[PDB]
Design a protein around this nucleic acid. Structure first.
Lengths: 757, 600, 138, 476
RNA sequence: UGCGAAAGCAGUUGAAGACAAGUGCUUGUCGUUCGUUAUAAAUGGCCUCG
């Protein structure tokens, strides 16, 4: 009956090598400069630059060769090496595959395999028919080898020959022309620049010569280099420093020139083709174009995220390619690729995948390096300790929630991600983002945080829901006071109601309630009202104190109003609360701690059994249909018939759900259809002979009353979340940012010749 | 929802045809026109006696009567008010069959007799509809003929459904247009269903279907809002118009036990998805959508009660939840007497509130997955414990803890499989029966800590455990859903300081300020003084409780002499508390000429 | 934009006496006449005027005091004594009222906000007294 | 790239009447009895004062015509619907008709009665007929053609009749209210002279007005009541007024957020607007020096600035008014492709906003504490600096000379509830940052002592606040 | 760092290797490792199109 199928895409793919800097971007612009090619973690997207739309998409699953092969793409080369709309993809393991775009994907591409002996392919490059490949072999520093690659037509094989070798490579970068390589080694350290296809350039010198004596006197941050850039001609080399100082060095005589505007560690440096211009970007969320001739600078401020990489892409420097990080989301690294114009500094193409916020960090994501160790960044020393601590947390600890809230829009079926202090509106039918809107106050895009400012925490959008009609948005936000202040412990709770007419794309704030339910009391749960009550313009808000508050939109006041209240001043606190409303809207089920309560809506108090006691705290209360109520407690789940007041089925969840999830995540994991049945999700940890990072999930389709399992399917990764689309199908989000769905003649020759002409 | 006591409308005459109680409802006809939600009048045809119109409120009274010969049987009767050529009038149309030799269709016009007319009908009249707008009387016959006459009984039209032996015909209006559907038996339990629209021919056939497996001889039928309800062998079959397809089947277990032949069953509709079912002298108000028994009433003073007709509420459009129904009740005794009785019915709000916990339909943990990953016999125990001798604590605990593999004297997250309430409640009984006085087993301590401690045994639990302070302390801390009334009484009765503190915290945690106050008003005026005097002699919870105490007693009842101590006492802590707050924060908190002494 | 702010405590939709002037001002909603009456700062006058004020008009005075305090918090104290005596004199009458929270919601909210200042001011004064005790001895 | 976010800093019905800001107080020589508005543009309004009637230009708000022929005191200045004719009564009982804007010529003179004629109103439906009321207690209905005999002489009033009204859409009905407390309704094509029915007001009737075809509002004594003719009973009644209500007028379909408004004079110096759509509930009011005898508003189709007029027994007239390169202009009407990309410049930012955008933390704090600066705006800049995480930074480079301005406001802002928490935030930092500088500076120490006296006082108020919260729990 | 409510209740912050500086000894560091649940500070601030 049911079947699972991946629908959307995932993150853009990056050359995630620590040593490589200035070459993270792997997306390439076509020779004709009419479309941009970007490899994702699971697909390859070709976007026509003129129209700014995904003209073509290549899914690895569709082709058997890519399905088996996909390992990540290390580079793309326009055209075919072996031999007008072909491309050659090189992956880390060494698979060289020639595929086609602007057309139909052939099920038999020219798959090849380069021979590498314990070498991980890192980069490849070419100037004119000559191909060199950089490879990695293993003091926590990787060593690199430069080989020559040629294709022999007799054997149809890629032969590899040795050219050069460097050891303990710390940082590396390649020129824009792809003909010079600059790198740093510990043999404190030394910089060496070498020509790749020729012996013309071969220079080396200790780093200390470039470093100023004052830099020696000051902290390590001043001596800590964060970025490298090399001019095409090889005369100029730009060094970045964590302190934010740029040093341009003339290779001819090792003469230094200081350019100092960045207040925080500079992340991206790139020279222009001519060399008179320098693009610089860092934590400031601002690009600086440095006029080297007069040491002047032009600014492109207020980016979406901090700049990881910069590059000039064009025969005359027509386009700039940018990588943005969105450092606010500490849990996950959100990369966005931006293609700007030198002419007017406008976005000709912005691309980025879904941007969920998980409760905790996942896999091996590490915060970018900064001048200091902060919440959104890591210091120089903090990197290794943080990496080890992250690994040991994923290994030994038991709390592995990684659960993200997501919302579905009934009217449009768009997906809403409550990103930090913002909402990302994304279309999974088109697999393209449609909007990014800030729902809160706070320092979000006014300015770029640097140094201690980075410790500031922006407002957190914890809950985001739609009404049944879909014309209204309810959002709940938490304001964190700044630290080191008397009022450093009074978190503020804010509720907002928004409305949007269907044609527009921007939601408008209609009402704001400050400190709902009182002061310092979180809104643990929110539930939109059913269509029966106030034709889908009412809602319920529930606390950890058992207080229930029913708001409604009244036409005469023209806004939302507080209609009903029930404030039982319980003396105990618990974040485990759940709320459900009948389809008719007559009765309300409120589960607080270990105790479920039935309330008459009209009087908004106990019905006149109203109390059901549970073994443990209740995480989820939902009614699959008007007759049956499924209640999940921290240890198990039980199906109860309100009509009989008796349990039909009981399933034991403790072996899988003990301390792995914080209370309230079962709400967003468990989903229910209003016609056919519900679904239960369980992720679990895999191992062979101590814990390993990889995760495996199982989805079970259950009928109303849980008598039978309609289906049992398995996914090979941690499914972060599921929701029930208003259609019969259910949509599930996977920690690789993957959204899948589980659901049920002379004239003819004359014409040809004229068309060619 | 509720059912009112039946009140008599009239006493049925002692006629031979009416003597057969089982068929008595067949010999009494209720006019559709005069009997609805808003009408206070009922027109009833009693076969062999008369057609009589009664007013119901304020008191039942006979308003009109038209006599009929005792040898005649009323097969169809209708009455409707309208305007006739214009004078306001009441038109009464009735059919009388005499010995099957002749059938008489009779129409009477009365001024609100203006006229009376009588014709010979070809077959027995099943249903009659009066259209006052067009001044038409439409009569359906058992042979399948639908004849449209004027008020003068002049035949204007005749339509043939092509099927004889018609058994049921019901009229209904949808979107301002009149409709009628008919049922005609066929052989082999096959049935022809036809739907006809009333507009060359004023009658248009919209649907014609043959429904299989539809028996009549033991089937009770009624229709409501496009749904046809069939009661047979204790199962209610619900069919949807205009093609009469079986949508759902509802099994009603309270009828399957009825022996076939002796029990008298009547079945009529009362509201949307709500029907009236009578089983001899018991009447049931049922909700078919939710399958719940909204109300039940037993008429101890009559042998049987048969529903005749019921005024049906369209609750979807009507705010009114009260209606009436008319039926025949037969008295107990050697000379049974039958009377016409009216029952007032409160259908309700048609919400899931009315149906919760009232179902008329009468566990064990199971693995999630049937079959390289982390892991983050109740009766047998019962009989073993029951087999023990009285006052054997060690054996009782040993069997319970060892058999259940319980490791701790208190409930833990690992003890879930024991959570089955049936097993626990039996163990509670064994502990009570086996052990009395001052010694109870350690098993009670474990059960006390259990979240699912039975509510039935919560009452008096503090009284049972008063003799052992340790058990009493445990009951305060973790025993679930302890009645507030007992704790309030124990709060003002116990003199131990520690127990007083523990009780108060439990009250504030588990009960609202409002819930505490009302019961706390009941407490005697002297007892509160003792508690207050205790205070004058973690504490903020007690002070909050005292704040409640001052709340319930009221400004009148406070006696000025005692308050003198309280303000001086209460002020004694405000100065202390203010002092403590001040301490709390603190712990959180060149010259032109100089003389200096050089060291050399 | 034009969205309005609101607080969760807004439970709205859930001789020498001047008594005659006060009663007329309250009945006629004459703010200027009510203002001059409120200007008196002599406590004995406040008690006597409220003493002779009819219980029915005493209720609406509470709302008038609530709104005026809300608009100008600096008048909270001087108008606090007024509401103090209204509850004192007409406490029994207020008890025999079907509903109080809805009609006195503004007083609830206005009164609550003042209390929330108390915890922080004590912290402010405690840090502040420490410094003052520092230089005074030095 | 995105534009920099901008720093973020009653009823809609109430805001409407506040726009009548300009108030001109003119002095007349006697009590102004009646005020009328001309039904057409320029909608100049007429005032009855002493022995003359004065017409005031709407725009100029000054007298343009004066009618002084009347020997005795004047009692009416009502226009006919067309506005060409103006009728007025006198104590002698003579009723005179003047062509509007032509005071010299008498168009028609009738002696209604020997007794005073207090009301003279043209019939709104019919031009020819004119209605007059006299102390004779007979409300004669005169006609322009017939100046020697009334067409109808309505009677039945046992006291002075000083209120005549015509029901809109119902020329049937002539409504009269006498000081008997009875409002009498008359039908004209009938024989007349006997009311259709009488409505009891229980108090002398001062003015009767027809709000709608079926709704008649009678303002008499200390309250005004609205009666529905179909039901023949008072639908609503309001008695908020203290003095006896005297005059009342109604305006509909005017550009306010409300569809209609109802203004009623009180004789207490109060004129209040009422909402017919909301059961005639209070929505706005004004106060004047003395009792109000007449009130009026500009008609719905004023076609310009609206006018609110109040008449006082002192003769004071209060008028409140709500005011209402040859190719450079081609605009490319005929061109194929039109492109517009010009972007309006952002609204002018204040000095403090510029500093924050420029990271001038210390100066922004300085801009906060400047003379004639709004208190609320001062909170925003302080809140923003706290929100930005720059509090110690802005307070670092400061001495006593530049520290006092912050403390001064803190001395006053500590009192305010909204700023109390913020004041505690900043005052805490300056102390932990300038404890030593406090030691060597006397002047601040005095600023420090007075801060104790005020913050201590607030503790008493906040303490007292917690006490009263106890009562409000007990009373409920 | 664990748990919990937000308040808080409990518990941690070790060892080795290498380098620099001062005088084999002392101190400080680590794009070095093993194990535990485990101030900052190179004068350096955000564009233009009314």
């Amino acid at each position: 009956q049911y079947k699972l199928s991946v629908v959307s895409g995932g993150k853009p793919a990056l050359n995630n090598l620590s040593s490589v800097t200035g070459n993270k971007n792997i997306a390439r612009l076509s020779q004709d400069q009419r479309n941009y090619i970007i490899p994702f973690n699971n697909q390859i997207k070709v976007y026509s630059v003129e129209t700014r739309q995904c003209v073509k998409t290549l899914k690895f699953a569709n082709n058997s060769l890519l399905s088996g092969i996909f390992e990540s793409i290390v580079k793309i080369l326009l055209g075919d090496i072996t031999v007008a709309h072909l491309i050659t993809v090189f992956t880390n393991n060494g698979h060289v595959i020639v595929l086609n775009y602007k057309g139909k994907l052939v099920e038999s591409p020219k798959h090849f395999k380069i021979s590498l002996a314990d070498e991980k392919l890192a980069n490849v490059f070419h100037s004119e028919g000559n191909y060199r490949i950089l490879t990695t072999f293993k003091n926590s520093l990787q060593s690199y080898r430069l080989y020559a690659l040629t294709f022999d037509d007799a054997k149809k094989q890629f032969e590899v020959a040795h050219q050069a070798e460097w050891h303990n490579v710390i940082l590396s970068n390649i020129s824009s022309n792809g003909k010079l390589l600059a790198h740093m080694c510990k043999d404190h350290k030394s910089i060496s620049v070498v020509s790749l296809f020729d012996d013309s350039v071969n220079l080396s010198f200790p780093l200390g010569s470039i470093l100023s004596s004052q830099t020696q006197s000051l902290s390590y941050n001043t001596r800590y280099v964060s970025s490298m850039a090399i001019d095409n001609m090889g005369q100029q080399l730009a060094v970045g420093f964590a302190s934010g100082v740029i040093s341009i060095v003339s290779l001819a005589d090792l003469q230094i020139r200081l350019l100092k505007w960045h207040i925080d560690s500079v992340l991206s440096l790139s020279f222009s083709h001519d060399g008179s211009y320098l693009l610089s970007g860092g934590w400031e969320k601002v690009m600086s174009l440095w006029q080297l001739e007069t040491n002047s600078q032009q600014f492109l401020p207020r980016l979406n995220g901090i700049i990881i990489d910069c590059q000039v892409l064009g025969p005359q420097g027509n386009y700039y390619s940018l990588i943005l990080q969105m450092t606010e989301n500490n849990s996950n690294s959100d990369y966005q690729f931006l293609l700007l114009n030198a002419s007017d500094l406008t976005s000709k193409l912005s691309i980025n995948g879904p941007l969920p916020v998980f409760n905790s960090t996942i896999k091996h994501i590490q915060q970018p390096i900064s001048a200091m160790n902060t919440k959104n960044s890591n210091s120089i020393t903090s990197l290794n300790h943080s990496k080890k601590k992250q690994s040991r947390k994923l290994i030994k600890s038991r709390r592995q929630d990684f659960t993200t809230n997501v919302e579905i829009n009934p009217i449009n079926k768009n997906l809403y991600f409550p990103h930090i202090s913002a909402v990302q509106i994304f279309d999974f039918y088109k697999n393209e983002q449609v909007n990014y809107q800030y729902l809160t106050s706070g320092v979000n895009n006014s300015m770029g945080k640097v140094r201690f400012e980075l410790n500031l925490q922006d407002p957190i959008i914890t809950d985001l829901k739609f009404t049944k009609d879909g014309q209204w948005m309810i959002t709940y936000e938490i304001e964190y006071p700044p630290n080191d202040l008397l009022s450093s412990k009074d978190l503020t709770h804010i509720l907002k109601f928004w409305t949007k007419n269907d044609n527009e794309t921007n939601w408008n704030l209609k009402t704001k309630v400050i400190n709902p339910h009182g002061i310092s009391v979180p809104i643990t749960k929110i539930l939109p009202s059913p269509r029966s009550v106030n034709n889908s313009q009412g809602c319920l808000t529930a606390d950890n104190n058992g207080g229930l508050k029913f708001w409604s939109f009244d036409s005469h006041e023209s806004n939302w109003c507080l209609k009903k209240i029930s404030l039982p001043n319980f003396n105990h606190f618990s974040n485990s609360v759940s709320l459900a409303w009948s389809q008719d809207g007559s009765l309300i089920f409120h589960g607080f701690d270990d105790k479920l309560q039935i309330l008459d809506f009209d009087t908004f108090k106990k019905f006149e059994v109203s109390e059901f006691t549970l073994d443990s705290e209740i995480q989820t209360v939902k009614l699959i249909n008007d007759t049956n109520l499924i209640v999940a407690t921290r240890t198990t789940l039980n199906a109860i018939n309100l009509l009989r007041g008796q349990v039909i089925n009981s399933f034991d969840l403790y072996p899988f759900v003990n301390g792995v999830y914080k209370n309230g995540h079962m709400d967003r994991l468990i989903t229910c259809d209003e016609r056919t049945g519900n679904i239960a999700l369980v992720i679990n940890q895999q191992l062979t002979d101590v814990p390993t990072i990889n995760y495996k999930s199982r989805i079970i389709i259950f009928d109303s009353d849980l008598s039978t399992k309609l289906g049992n399917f398995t996914h090979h990764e941690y499914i972060s979340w599921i929701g029930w689309n208003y259609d019969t199908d259910f949509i599930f989000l996977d920690i690789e940012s993957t959204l899948g769905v589980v659901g049920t003649s002379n004239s003819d020759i004359f014409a040809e010749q004229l068309h060619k002409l | 929802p509720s059912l009112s006591q039946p009140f008599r409308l009239a006493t049925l005459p002692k006629i031979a045809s009416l003597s057969n109680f089982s068929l008595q409802a067949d010999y009494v006809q209720v006019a559709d026109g005069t009997f609805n939600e808003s009408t206070n009048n009922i027109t009833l045809g009693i076969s062999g006696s008369s057609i009589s119109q009664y007013i119901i409120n304020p008191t039942p009274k006979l308003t009109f009567d038209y006599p009929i010969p005792s040898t005649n049987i009323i097969t169809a009767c209708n009455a409707e008010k309208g305007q006739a050529n214009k004078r306001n009038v009441e038109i009464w149309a009735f059919g009388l069959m005499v010995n099957k030799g002749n059938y008489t269709l009779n129409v009477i016009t009365k001024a609100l007799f203006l006229s009376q007319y009588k014709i010979k009908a070809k077959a027995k009249v099943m249903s009659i509809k009066i259209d006052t707008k067009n001044s038409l009387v439409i009569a359906i016959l058992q042979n399948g003929l639908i004849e449209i006459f004027d008020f003068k009984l002049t035949l204007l039209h005749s339509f043939d459904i092509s099927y004889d032996n018609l058994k049921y015909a019901k009229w209904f209006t949808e979107n301002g247009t009149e409709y009628v559907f008919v049922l005609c038996p066929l052989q082999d339990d096959k049935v022809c269903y036809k739907l006809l629209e009333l507009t060359s021919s004023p009658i248009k056939e919209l649907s014609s279907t043959i429904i299989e497996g539809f028996s009549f001889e033991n089937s009770k039928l009624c229709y409501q809002f496009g749904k046809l309800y069939k009661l047979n062998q204790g199962k209610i079959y619900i069919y949807s118009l205009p093609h009469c397809q079986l949508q759902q089947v509802i099994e009603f277990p309270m009828v399957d036990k009825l022996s076939p032949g002796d029990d008298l069953i009547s079945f009529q509709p009362v509201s949307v998805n709500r029907v009236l079912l009578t089983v001899n002298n018991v009447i049931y108000l049922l909700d078919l959508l939710h399958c719940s028994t909204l109300s039940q009433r037993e008429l101890t003073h009559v042998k049987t009660f048969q529903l005749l007709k019921s005024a049906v509420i369209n609750s979807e459009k009507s705010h009114n939840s009260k209606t009436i129904a008319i039926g025949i009740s037969t008295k107990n005794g050697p000379n049974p007497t039958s009377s016409l009785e009216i029952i007032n019915i409160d259908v309700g709000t048609n919400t899931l509130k009315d149906s919760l916990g009232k179902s008329f339909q009468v566990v064990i943990l199971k693995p999630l997955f049937d079959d390289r990953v982390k892991c983050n016999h109740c009766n047998e125990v019962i009989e073993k414990l029951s087999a023990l001798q009285d006052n054997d604590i060690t054996s009782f605990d040993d069997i319970f803890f060892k058999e259940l593999k319980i490791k701790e004297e208190h409930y833990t997250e690992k003890d879930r499989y024991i959570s089955d309430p049936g097993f626990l409640n039996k163990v509670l009984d064994l502990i009570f029966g086996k052990f009395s006085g001052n010694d109870y087993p350690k098993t009670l301590t474990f059960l006390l800590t259990h979240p699912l401690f039975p509510l039935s045994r919560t009452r008096n639990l503090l009284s049972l455990l008063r003799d052992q302070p340790r058990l009493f302390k445990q009951a305060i801390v973790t025993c679930p859903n302890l009645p507030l009334n007992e704790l309030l009484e124990e709060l003002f009765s116990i003199r131990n300081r520690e127990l007083l503190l523990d009780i108060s915290f439990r009250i504030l945690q588990d009960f609202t300020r409002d819930s505490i106050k009302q019961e706390m008003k009941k407490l005697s005026k002297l007892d509160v003084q003792n508690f207050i005097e205790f205070i004058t002699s973690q504490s903020t919870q007690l002070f909050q409780l005292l704040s409640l105490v001052l709340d319930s007693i009221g400004l009148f009842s406070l006696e000025g002499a005692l308050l003198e101590n309280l303000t001086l006492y209460i002020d004694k802590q405000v100065e202390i508390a203010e002092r403590n707050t001040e301490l709390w924060n603190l712990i959180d908190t060149l010259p032109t000429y100089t003389m200096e002494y050089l060291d050399i | 934009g034009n969205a309005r702010v609101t607080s969760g405590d807004n439970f709205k939709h859930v001789t020498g006496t001047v008594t005659v002037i006060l009663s007329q001002a309250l009945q006629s909603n004459d703010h200027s006449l009510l203002e001059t009456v409120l200007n008196n700062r002599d406590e004995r006058v406040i008690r006597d005027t409220i003493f002779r004020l009819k219980p029915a008009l005493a209720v609406i005075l509470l709302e008038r005091l609530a709104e005026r305090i809300a608009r100008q918090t600096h008048r909270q104290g001087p108008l606090n004594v007024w509401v103090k005596w209204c509850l004192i004199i007409h406490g029994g009458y207020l008890v025999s009222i079907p509903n109080l929270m809805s009609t006195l919601s503004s007083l609830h909210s206005t009164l609550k906000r003042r209390s929330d200042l108390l915890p922080r001011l004590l912290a402010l004064d405690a840090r502040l007294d420490c410094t003052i005790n520092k230089f005074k001895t030095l | 790239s995105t534009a920099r976010p901008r720093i973020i800093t009653t009823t809609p019905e109430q805001r409407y009447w506040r726009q009548y800001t300009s108030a001109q107080l003119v002095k007349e020589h006697n009590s102004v009895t009646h005020i009328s508005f001309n039904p057409q543009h320029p909608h100049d309004f007429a005032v009855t004062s002493s022995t003359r009637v004065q017409i005031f230009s709407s725009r100029t708000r000054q007298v343009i015509k004066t009618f002084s022929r009347f020997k005795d005191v004047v009692y009416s200045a009502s226009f006919r619907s067309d506005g060409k004719l103006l009728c007025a009564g006198d104590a002698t009982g003579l009723v005179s008709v003047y062509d509007s804007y032509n005071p010299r010529t008498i168009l028609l003179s009738i002696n209604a009665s020997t007794h005073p004629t207090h009301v003279t109103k043209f019939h709104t439906q019919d031009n020819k007929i004119l209605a007059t009321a006299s102390d004779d207690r007979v409300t004669r209905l005169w006609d322009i053609s017939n100046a020697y005999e009334p067409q109808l002489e309505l009677t039945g009033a046992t006291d002075y009749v000083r209120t005549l009204s015509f029901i809109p859409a119902a020329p049937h009905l002539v409504a009269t209210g006498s000081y008997d407390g009875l409002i009498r309704l008359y039908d004209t094509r009938s024989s007349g002279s006997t009311p259709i029915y009488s409505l009891n007001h229980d108090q002398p009737v001062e003015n009767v007005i027809a709000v709608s075809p079926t709704q008649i509002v009678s303002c008499g004594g200390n309250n005004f009541k609205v009666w529905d003719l179909t039901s023949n009973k008072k639908l609503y009644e309001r008695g908020n007024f203290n003095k006896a209500v005297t005059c009342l007028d109604y305006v509909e379909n005017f550009d306010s957020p409300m569809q209609s408004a109802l203004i009623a004079s009180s004789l207490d110096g109060h004129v209040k607007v009422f909402d017919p759509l909301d059961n005639f509930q209070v929505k706005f009011g004004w106060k004047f020096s003395g009792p109000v005898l007449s009130c009026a508003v500009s008609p719905s189709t004023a076609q310009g600035n609206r006018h609110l007029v109040a008449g006082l027994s002192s003769g004071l007239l209060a008028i409140r008014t709500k005011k209402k390169m040859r190719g450079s202009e081609y605009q490319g009407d005929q061109e194929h492709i039109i492109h517009n990309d010009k972007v309006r410049s952002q609204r002018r930012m204040r000095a403090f906003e510029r500093n924050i955008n420029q990271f001038k933390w210390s100066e922004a704090l300085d801009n906060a504490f400047v003379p004639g600066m709004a208190k609320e705006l001062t909170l925003t800049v302080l809140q923003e600096l706290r929100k930005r995480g720059k509090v110690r930074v802005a307070l670092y480079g400061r001495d006593e000379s530049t520290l006092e301005p912050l403390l001064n406001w803190c001395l006053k802002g500590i009192e305010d509830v909204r700023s109390a928490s913020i004041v505690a935030d900043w005052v805490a930092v300056v102390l932990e940052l300038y404890g030593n500088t406090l030691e060597s500076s006397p002047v601040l120490q005095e600023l420090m002592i007075d801060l104790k006296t005020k913050v201590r006082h607030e503790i008493h108020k906040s303490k007292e606040a917690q006490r009263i919260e106890g009562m409000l729990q007990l009373l409920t």
